[PDB]
PDB file of all heavy atoms in Angstrom:
ATOM      1  N   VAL A   1       0.837  -1.166  -0.003  1.00 24.55           N
ATOM      2  CA  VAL A   1      -0.025  -0.007  -0.018  1.00 24.55           C
ATOM      3  C   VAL A   1       0.808   1.263   0.003  1.00 24.55           C
ATOM      4  O   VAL A   1       0.378   2.359   0.260  1.00 24.55           O
ATOM      5  CB  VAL A   1      -0.955   0.005   1.251  1.00 24.55           C
ATOM      6  CG1 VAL A   1      -1.970  -1.173   1.161  1.00 24.55           C
ATOM      7  CG2 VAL A   1      -0.108  -0.061   2.546  1.00 24.55           C
ATOM      8  N   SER A   2       2.159   1.107  -0.236  1.00 27.58           N
ATOM      9  CA  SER A   2       3.117   2.201  -0.145  1.00 27.58           C
ATOM     10  C   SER A   2       2.952   3.450  -0.936  1.00 27.58           C
ATOM     11  O   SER A   2       3.325   4.497  -0.533  1.00 27.58           O
ATOM     12  CB  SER A   2       4.470   1.653  -0.466  1.00 27.58           C
ATOM     13  OG  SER A   2       4.505   0.173  -0.401  1.00 27.58           O
ATOM     14  N   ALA A   3       2.293   3.349  -2.123  1.00 27.89           N
ATOM     15  CA  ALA A   3       2.004   4.469  -3.005  1.00 27.89           C
ATOM     16  C   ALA A   3       0.955   5.368  -2.507  1.00 27.89           C
ATOM     17  O   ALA A   3       0.650   6.515  -3.105  1.00 27.89           O
ATOM     18  CB  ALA A   3       1.735   4.005  -4.371  1.00 27.89           C
ATOM     19  N   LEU A   4       0.071   4.951  -1.570  1.00 28.76           N
ATOM     20  CA  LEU A   4      -0.970   5.790  -1.047  1.00 28.76           C
ATOM     21  C   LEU A   4      -0.423   6.692  -0.014  1.00 28.76           C
ATOM     22  O   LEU A   4      -0.644   7.828   0.065  1.00 28.76           O
ATOM     23  CB  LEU A   4      -2.149   4.887  -0.398  1.00 28.76           C
ATOM     24  CG  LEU A   4      -2.500   3.612  -1.200  1.00 28.76           C
ATOM     25  CD1 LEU A   4      -3.492   2.803  -0.389  1.00 28.76           C
ATOM     26  CD2 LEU A   4      -3.121   3.932  -2.560  1.00 28.76           C
ATOM     27  N   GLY A   5       0.425   6.038   0.838  1.00 25.92           N
ATOM     28  CA  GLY A   5       1.069   6.806   1.869  1.00 25.92           C
ATOM     29  C   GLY A   5       0.178   6.893   3.126  1.00 25.92           C
ATOM     30  O   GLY A   5      -1.007   7.112   2.996  1.00 25.92           O
ATOM     31  N   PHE A   6       0.770   6.825   4.307  1.00 22.15           N
ATOM     32  CA  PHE A   6       0.008   6.935   5.568  1.00 22.15           C
ATOM     33  C   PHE A   6       1.040   7.578   6.583  1.00 22.15           C
ATOM     34  O   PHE A   6       2.158   7.156   6.599  1.00 22.15           O
ATOM     35  CB  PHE A   6      -0.463   5.599   6.064  1.00 22.15           C
ATOM     36  CG  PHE A   6      -1.457   4.996   5.167  1.00 22.15           C
ATOM     37  CD1 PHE A   6      -1.084   3.858   4.352  1.00 22.15           C
ATOM     38  CD2 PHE A   6      -2.780   5.463   5.137  1.00 22.15           C
ATOM     39  CE1 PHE A   6      -2.067   3.293   3.414  1.00 22.15           C
ATOM     40  CE2 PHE A   6      -3.742   4.920   4.255  1.00 22.15           C
ATOM     41  CZ  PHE A   6      -3.390   3.836   3.405  1.00 22.15           C
ATOM     42  N   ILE A   7       0.567   8.511   7.381  1.00 23.88           N
ATOM     43  CA  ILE A   7       1.451   9.215   8.373  1.00 23.88           C
ATOM     44  C   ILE A   7       1.528   8.437   9.669  1.00 23.88           C
ATOM     45  O   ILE A   7       2.357   8.698  10.522  1.00 23.88           O
ATOM     46  CB  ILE A   7       0.869  10.699   8.559  1.00 23.88           C
ATOM     47  CG1 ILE A   7       2.040  11.643   9.096  1.00 23.88           C
ATOM     48  CG2 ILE A   7      -0.321  10.807   9.400  1.00 23.88           C
ATOM     49  CD1 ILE A   7       3.166  11.892   8.084  1.00 23.88           C
ATOM     50  N   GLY A   8       0.649   7.426   9.850  1.00 24.31           N
ATOM     51  CA  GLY A   8       0.665   6.612  11.052  1.00 24.31           C
ATOM     52  C   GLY A   8       0.016   5.303  10.791  1.00 24.31           C
ATOM     53  O   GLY A   8      -0.657   5.131   9.796  1.00 24.31           O
ATOM     54  N   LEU A   9       0.087   4.397  11.698  1.00 26.95           N
ATOM     55  CA  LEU A   9      -0.378   2.996  11.582  1.00 26.95           C
ATOM     56  C   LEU A   9      -1.324   2.565  12.709  1.00 26.95           C
ATOM     57  O   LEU A   9      -1.706   1.400  12.650  1.00 26.95           O
ATOM     58  CB  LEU A   9       0.811   1.996  11.533  1.00 26.95           C
ATOM     59  CG  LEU A   9       1.880   2.296  10.459  1.00 26.95           C
ATOM     60  CD1 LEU A   9       3.028   1.268  10.639  1.00 26.95           C
ATOM     61  CD2 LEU A   9       1.312   2.131   9.057  1.00 26.95           C
ATOM     62  N   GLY A  10      -1.670   3.475  13.624  1.00 22.70           N
ATOM     63  CA  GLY A  10      -2.412   3.054  14.739  1.00 22.70           C
ATOM     64  C   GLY A  10      -3.380   4.048  15.325  1.00 22.70           C
ATOM     65  O   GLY A  10      -3.346   4.392  16.493  1.00 22.70           O
ATOM     66  N   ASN A  11      -4.315   4.611  14.492  1.00 26.14           N
ATOM     67  CA  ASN A  11      -5.379   5.494  15.034  1.00 26.14           C
ATOM     68  C   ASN A  11      -6.598   5.492  14.095  1.00 26.14           C
ATOM     69  O   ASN A  11      -7.702   5.336  14.573  1.00 26.14           O
ATOM     70  CB  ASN A  11      -4.835   6.901  15.223  1.00 26.14           C
ATOM     71  CG  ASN A  11      -5.866   7.962  15.373  1.00 26.14           C
ATOM     72  OD1 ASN A  11      -6.417   8.520  14.447  1.00 26.14           O
ATOM     73  ND2 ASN A  11      -6.084   8.324  16.685  1.00 26.14           N
ATOM     74  N   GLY A  12      -6.393   5.652  12.793  1.00 27.24           N
ATOM     75  CA  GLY A  12      -7.560   5.461  11.890  1.00 27.24           C
ATOM     76  C   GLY A  12      -8.128   6.738  11.313  1.00 27.24           C
ATOM     77  O   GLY A  12      -9.086   6.644  10.508  1.00 27.24           O
ATOM     78  N   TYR A  13      -7.616   7.903  11.702  1.00 32.09           N
ATOM     79  CA  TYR A  13      -8.096   9.156  11.247  1.00 32.09           C
ATOM     80  C   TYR A  13      -6.904  10.069  10.792  1.00 32.09           C
ATOM     81  O   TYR A  13      -5.807   9.833  11.287  1.00 32.09           O
ATOM     82  CB  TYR A  13      -8.888   9.880  12.325  1.00 32.09           C
ATOM     83  CG  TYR A  13     -10.061   9.035  12.798  1.00 32.09           C
ATOM     84  CD1 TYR A  13      -9.948   8.167  13.879  1.00 32.09           C
ATOM     85  CD2 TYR A  13     -11.338   9.141  12.184  1.00 32.09           C
ATOM     86  CE1 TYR A  13     -11.040   7.397  14.308  1.00 32.09           C
ATOM     87  CE2 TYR A  13     -12.483   8.361  12.636  1.00 32.09           C
ATOM     88  CZ  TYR A  13     -12.275   7.499  13.683  1.00 32.09           C
ATOM     89  OH  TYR A  13     -13.336   6.723  14.127  1.00 32.09           O
ATOM     90  N   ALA A  14      -7.176  10.996   9.955  1.00 34.43           N
ATOM     91  CA  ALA A  14      -6.210  12.025   9.489  1.00 34.43           C
ATOM     92  C   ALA A  14      -4.924  11.372   8.943  1.00 34.43           C
ATOM     93  O   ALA A  14      -3.860  11.829   9.153  1.00 34.43           O
ATOM     94  CB  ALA A  14      -5.896  13.017  10.634  1.00 34.43           C
ATOM     95  N   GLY A  15      -5.136  10.408   8.074  1.00 27.81           N
ATOM     96  CA  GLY A  15      -4.037   9.762   7.367  1.00 27.81           C
ATOM     97  C   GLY A  15      -3.343   8.710   8.086  1.00 27.81           C
ATOM     98  O   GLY A  15      -2.308   8.170   7.573  1.00 27.81           O
ATOM     99  N   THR A  16      -3.778   8.338   9.273  1.00 28.79           N
ATOM    100  CA  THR A  16      -3.232   7.272  10.054  1.00 28.79           C
ATOM    101  C   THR A  16      -4.130   6.001   9.864  1.00 28.79           C
ATOM    102  O   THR A  16      -5.258   6.151   9.783  1.00 28.79           O
ATOM    103  CB  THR A  16      -3.190   7.589  11.574  1.00 28.79           C
ATOM    104  OG1 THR A  16      -4.468   7.757  12.046  1.00 28.79           O
ATOM    105  CG2 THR A  16      -2.412   8.910  11.843  1.00 28.79           C
ATOM    106  N   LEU A  17      -3.483   4.884   9.710  1.00 26.10           N
ATOM    107  CA  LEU A  17      -4.306   3.646   9.414  1.00 26.10           C
ATOM    108  C   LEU A  17      -4.830   3.100  10.770  1.00 26.10           C
ATOM    109  O   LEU A  17      -4.234   3.336  11.902  1.00 26.10           O
ATOM    110  CB  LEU A  17      -3.362   2.591   8.793  1.00 26.10           C
ATOM    111  CG  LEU A  17      -3.431   2.575   7.292  1.00 26.10           C
ATOM    112  CD1 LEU A  17      -2.374   1.560   6.836  1.00 26.10           C
ATOM    113  CD2 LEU A  17      -4.764   2.227   6.668  1.00 26.10           C
ATOM    114  N   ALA A  18      -5.892   2.315  10.652  1.00 25.18           N
ATOM    115  CA  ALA A  18      -6.338   1.373  11.728  1.00 25.18           C
ATOM    116  C   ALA A  18      -7.013   0.230  11.002  1.00 25.18           C
ATOM    117  O   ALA A  18      -7.264   0.321   9.809  1.00 25.18           O
ATOM    118  CB  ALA A  18      -7.337   2.160  12.630  1.00 25.18           C
ATOM    119  N   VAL A  19      -7.353  -0.811  11.755  1.00 26.06           N
ATOM    120  CA  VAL A  19      -7.982  -1.966  11.223  1.00 26.06           C
ATOM    121  C   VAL A  19      -9.302  -2.125  11.915  1.00 26.06           C
ATOM    122  O   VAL A  19      -9.510  -1.655  13.058  1.00 26.06           O
ATOM    123  CB  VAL A  19      -7.101  -3.197  11.345  1.00 26.06           C
ATOM    124  CG1 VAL A  19      -6.896  -3.665  12.830  1.00 26.06           C
ATOM    125  CG2 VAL A  19      -7.615  -4.407  10.569  1.00 26.06           C
ATOM    126  N   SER A  20     -10.297  -2.593  11.256  1.00 25.45           N
ATOM    127  CA  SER A  20     -11.672  -2.766  11.772  1.00 25.45           C
ATOM    128  C   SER A  20     -12.225  -4.130  11.305  1.00 25.45           C
ATOM    129  O   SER A  20     -11.662  -4.614  10.257  1.00 25.45           O
ATOM    130  CB  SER A  20     -12.570  -1.645  11.310  1.00 25.45           C
ATOM    131  OG  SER A  20     -12.007  -0.392  11.657  1.00 25.45           O
ATOM    132  N   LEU A  21     -13.185  -4.623  11.930  1.00 26.47           N
ATOM    133  CA  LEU A  21     -13.851  -5.898  11.564  1.00 26.47           C
ATOM    134  C   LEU A  21     -15.280  -5.765  11.441  1.00 26.47           C
ATOM    135  O   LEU A  21     -15.785  -4.796  12.055  1.00 26.47           O
ATOM    136  CB  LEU A  21     -13.487  -7.024  12.614  1.00 26.47           C
ATOM    137  CG  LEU A  21     -12.021  -7.460  12.737  1.00 26.47           C
ATOM    138  CD1 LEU A  21     -11.891  -8.242  14.032  1.00 26.47           C
ATOM    139  CD2 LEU A  21     -11.647  -8.320  11.576  1.00 26.47           C
ATOM    140  N   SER A  22     -15.972  -6.642  10.775  1.00 29.94           N
ATOM    141  CA  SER A  22     -17.451  -6.682  10.769  1.00 29.94           C
ATOM    142  C   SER A  22     -17.863  -7.353  12.082  1.00 29.94           C
ATOM    143  O   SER A  22     -17.055  -7.967  12.742  1.00 29.94           O
ATOM    144  CB  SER A  22     -17.948  -7.517   9.563  1.00 29.94           C
ATOM    145  OG  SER A  22     -17.284  -8.725   9.501  1.00 29.94           O
ATOM    146  N   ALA A  23     -19.118  -7.273  12.374  1.00 31.05           N
ATOM    147  CA  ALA A  23     -19.690  -7.778  13.633  1.00 31.05           C
ATOM    148  C   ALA A  23     -19.508  -9.327  13.768  1.00 31.05           C
ATOM    149  O   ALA A  23     -19.712  -9.935  14.840  1.00 31.05           O
ATOM    150  CB  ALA A  23     -21.144  -7.346  13.791  1.00 31.05           C
ATOM    151  N   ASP A  24     -19.340 -10.025  12.631  1.00 27.93           N
ATOM    152  CA  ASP A  24     -19.188 -11.482  12.615  1.00 27.93           C
ATOM    153  C   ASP A  24     -17.782 -11.887  12.267  1.00 27.93           C
ATOM    154  O   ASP A  24     -17.463 -13.078  12.079  1.00 27.93           O
ATOM    155  CB  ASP A  24     -20.157 -12.007  11.505  1.00 27.93           C
ATOM    156  CG  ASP A  24     -19.986 -11.268  10.138  1.00 27.93           C
ATOM    157  OD1 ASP A  24     -19.003 -10.659   9.908  1.00 27.93           O
ATOM    158  OD2 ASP A  24     -20.980 -11.270   9.398  1.00 27.93           O
ATOM    159  N   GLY A  25     -16.935 -10.920  12.132  1.00 30.24           N
ATOM    160  CA  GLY A  25     -15.500 -11.161  11.869  1.00 30.24           C
ATOM    161  C   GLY A  25     -15.225 -11.657  10.418  1.00 30.24           C
ATOM    162  O   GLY A  25     -14.101 -11.907  10.106  1.00 30.24           O
ATOM    163  N   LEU A  26     -16.298 -11.699   9.587  1.00 34.63           N
ATOM    164  CA  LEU A  26     -16.179 -12.209   8.287  1.00 34.63           C
ATOM    165  C   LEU A  26     -15.576 -11.278   7.262  1.00 34.63           C
ATOM    166  O   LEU A  26     -15.266 -11.661   6.073  1.00 34.63           O
ATOM    167  CB  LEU A  26     -17.530 -12.781   7.750  1.00 34.63           C
ATOM    168  CG  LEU A  26     -18.195 -13.912   8.579  1.00 34.63           C
ATOM    169  CD1 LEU A  26     -19.536 -14.234   7.951  1.00 34.63           C
ATOM    170  CD2 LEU A  26     -17.285 -15.132   8.599  1.00 34.63           C
ATOM    171  N   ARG A  27     -15.462  -9.997   7.685  1.00 33.79           N
ATOM    172  CA  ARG A  27     -14.919  -8.977   6.807  1.00 33.79           C
ATOM    173  C   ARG A  27     -14.027  -8.142   7.610  1.00 33.79           C
ATOM    174  O   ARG A  27     -14.186  -8.017   8.797  1.00 33.79           O
ATOM    175  CB  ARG A  27     -16.008  -8.070   6.108  1.00 33.79           C
ATOM    176  CG  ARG A  27     -17.003  -8.877   5.295  1.00 33.79           C
ATOM    177  CD  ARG A  27     -18.037  -8.023   4.542  1.00 33.79           C
ATOM    178  NE  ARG A  27     -19.007  -8.904   3.915  1.00 33.79           N
ATOM    179  CZ  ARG A  27     -19.994  -8.481   3.125  1.00 33.79           C
ATOM    180  NH1 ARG A  27     -20.197  -7.238   2.943  1.00 33.79           N
ATOM    181  NH2 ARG A  27     -20.788  -9.385   2.481  1.00 33.79           N
ATOM    182  N   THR A  28     -13.043  -7.548   6.963  1.00 37.95           N
ATOM    183  CA  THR A  28     -11.955  -6.746   7.608  1.00 37.95           C
ATOM    184  C   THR A  28     -11.790  -5.470   6.854  1.00 37.95           C
ATOM    185  O   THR A  28     -12.008  -5.525   5.620  1.00 37.95           O
ATOM    186  CB  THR A  28     -10.676  -7.581   7.744  1.00 37.95           C
ATOM    187  OG1 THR A  28     -10.920  -8.874   8.225  1.00 37.95           O
ATOM    188  CG2 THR A  28      -9.647  -6.826   8.621  1.00 37.95           C
ATOM    189  N   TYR A  29     -11.474  -4.431   7.470  1.00 37.19           N
ATOM    190  CA  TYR A  29     -11.319  -3.069   6.756  1.00 37.19           C
ATOM    191  C   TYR A  29     -10.088  -2.357   7.219  1.00 37.19           C
ATOM    192  O   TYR A  29      -9.690  -2.532   8.348  1.00 37.19           O
ATOM    193  CB  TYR A  29     -12.602  -2.210   7.085  1.00 37.19           C
ATOM    194  CG  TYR A  29     -13.952  -2.969   6.999  1.00 37.19           C
ATOM    195  CD1 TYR A  29     -14.648  -3.406   8.116  1.00 37.19           C
ATOM    196  CD2 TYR A  29     -14.449  -3.255   5.668  1.00 37.19           C
ATOM    197  CE1 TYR A  29     -15.791  -4.148   7.967  1.00 37.19           C
ATOM    198  CE2 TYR A  29     -15.640  -3.993   5.506  1.00 37.19           C
ATOM    199  CZ  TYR A  29     -16.366  -4.376   6.695  1.00 37.19           C
ATOM    200  OH  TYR A  29     -17.538  -5.135   6.608  1.00 37.19           O
ATOM    201  N   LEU A  30      -9.499  -1.661   6.286  1.00 36.50           N
ATOM    202  CA  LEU A  30      -8.374  -0.770   6.701  1.00 36.50           C
ATOM    203  C   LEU A  30      -8.810   0.607   6.333  1.00 36.50           C
ATOM    204  O   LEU A  30      -9.177   0.884   5.237  1.00 36.50           O
ATOM    205  CB  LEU A  30      -7.135  -1.172   5.805  1.00 36.50           C
ATOM    206  CG  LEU A  30      -6.322  -2.397   6.200  1.00 36.50           C
ATOM    207  CD1 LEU A  30      -7.022  -3.755   5.813  1.00 36.50           C
ATOM    208  CD2 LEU A  30      -4.957  -2.324   5.508  1.00 36.50           C
ATOM    209  N   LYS A  31      -8.745   1.470   7.343  1.00 32.90           N
ATOM    210  CA  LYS A  31      -9.308   2.837   7.168  1.00 32.90           C
ATOM    211  C   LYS A  31      -8.324   3.902   7.646  1.00 32.90           C
ATOM    212  O   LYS A  31      -7.465   3.560   8.505  1.00 32.90           O
ATOM    213  CB  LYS A  31     -10.623   3.022   7.988  1.00 32.90           C
ATOM    214  CG  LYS A  31     -11.759   2.157   7.373  1.00 32.90           C
ATOM    215  CD  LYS A  31     -13.079   2.722   7.909  1.00 32.90           C
ATOM    216  CE  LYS A  31     -14.257   1.960   7.310  1.00 32.90           C
ATOM    217  NZ  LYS A  31     -15.541   2.596   7.786  1.00 32.90           N
ATOM    218  N   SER A  32      -8.457   5.077   7.094  1.00 33.75           N
ATOM    219  CA  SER A  32      -7.528   6.173   7.427  1.00 33.75           C
ATOM    220  C   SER A  32      -8.116   7.578   7.582  1.00 33.75           C
ATOM    221  O   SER A  32      -7.497   8.428   8.093  1.00 33.75           O
ATOM    222  CB  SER A  32      -6.457   6.236   6.359  1.00 33.75           C
ATOM    223  OG  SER A  32      -7.050   6.549   5.116  1.00 33.75           O
TER     224      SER A  32
END
């Protein structure tokens, strides 16, 4: 994912990544 760029890896807002799951764990999301 290096060409998108992220200023952090552990928050999920303002250009920092975080990970999230669906309520059944069957889907996973990466948000920034």
Side-chain angles (χ1 to χ4, degrees):
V1 297
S2 343
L4 314 175
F6 296 104
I7 201 70
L9 302 176
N11 169 275
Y13 301 90
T16 64
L17 271 172
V19 67
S20 305
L21 292 167
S22 52
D24 51 19
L26 299 176
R27 300 184 184 184
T28 308
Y29 314 103
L30 283 75
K31 291 198 177 185
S32 63

